Amino acid sequence: VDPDIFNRDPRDHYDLLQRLGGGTYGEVFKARDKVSGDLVALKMVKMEPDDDVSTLQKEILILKTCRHANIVAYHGSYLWLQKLWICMEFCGAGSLQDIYQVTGSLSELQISYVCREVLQGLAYLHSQKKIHRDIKGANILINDAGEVRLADFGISAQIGAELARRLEFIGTPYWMAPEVAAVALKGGYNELCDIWSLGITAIELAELQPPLFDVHPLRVLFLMTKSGYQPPRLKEKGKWSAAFHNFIKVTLTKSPKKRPSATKMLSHQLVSQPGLNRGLILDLLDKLKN
Ligand SMILES: CN1CCC2(CC1)CN(c1ncnc3[nH]c(Cl)c(-c4cccc(C#N)c4)c13)CCO2
């Protein structure tokens, strides 16, 4: 299917180092290029005859076609002996979740900078008709240069494959009510779901967990679907500026018809204020080291 797939053992090119962690699926390993010495992350997914090939096809299609400074670099994929290895950028400091578990809460300027960089990556993804659908601290990586990169298109690939598979058993739409046609064509939502998740992520970076993290997941799902659901807010109002409170208020707009787009959010005071540069992330990395 993909003409650029390498039909060889990745071990021909890389020496496999330690296990780094897991993604939505697959296992991610640190590896080193045998000729250049460049470090990479190799995500290994089992690919036996009855494994989910459509999702992996969709994930590699996203990685190959969505190249941006705020998305982890993709180097190519290997298929050998029923294992698929996806080669991506090695981001030395891991995710923001790994960082704040050592470092504690990020400052408002650091959160603003992360939000700006993630919004640039989201505006790019949405412009190519892609939706991340899994924005959280665990999926925002920080490299040694203090660059902010979105990772793990596993959820995006699974939904993309499921929606393509379903649009074969859809049948004629002429008798469908508009709200049924909406779930048939778009799954009942749009790319603005990523704006809400970024608002939640900003709270997560400020408080070390998303709102209601201690509440049973099924109860959280039930509460969100009910009428009268109030969007979350920062708990310590006095610790944060009016700009940060307004950023949370507008990214957490309950109605998707009124939630601002990534490009509109890029004009917000929080991500347009003075003093936003990689130096803020370099300070976070200094705290992580010491
Ligand atoms: C909770 N944390 C999450 C992140 C992590 C430690 C545990 C670390 N992590 C990485 N570390 C360094 N460079 C990397 N390059 C890349 Cl791409 C990753 C990476 C990070 C997150 C998801 C995926 C995927 N699909 C890949 C990555 C692998 C996953 O687990």
Domain ranges across the chain: 10-89, 96-289
Q: Is position 134 annotated as part of the catalytic site?
A: yes
Closest atom of ligand 1 relative to the 141 alpha carbon: 20
DSSP-assigned letter for residue 176: -
CA dist., res. 256 & res. 281, Å (int): 31
Q: CA triplet 61, 62, 63: central angle to 5 degrees? A: 95
Give yes or no for a contact between 114 and 148, defined as CB atoms under 8 angstroms apart. yes
Residue nearest to ligand 1 atom 10, measured at CA: 94
Rounded to the nearest whole angstrom, what is the distance from the C-alpha of residue 227 to the centroid of ligand 1?
Answer: 37
Resolution in Å, one decimal, please. Answer: 1.8
Closest atom of ligand 1 relative to the 89 alpha carbon: 15
The third-level CATH classification (topology) of the domain covering 96-289 is: Transferase(Phosphotransferase); domain 1 (1.10.510)
CATH code at 10-89: 3.30.200.20
Which residues lie closer than 8 Å to 206 by C-beta, 6 or more apart? 105, 106, 108, 111, 234, 239, 240
Same CATH fold assignment for domains 10-89 and 96-289: no
Give yes or no for a contact between 191 and 131, defined as CB atoms under 8 angstroms apart. yes
Residue 23 labeled ligand binder = yes
CA dist., res. 248 & res. 209, Å (int): 15
Which of these is catalytic: 52, 134, 214, 283? Answer: 134
Q: CA triplet 79, 80, 81: central angle to 5 degrees? A: 135
Solving technique: X-ray
Which residue's entry shows tokens 């400091």? 93
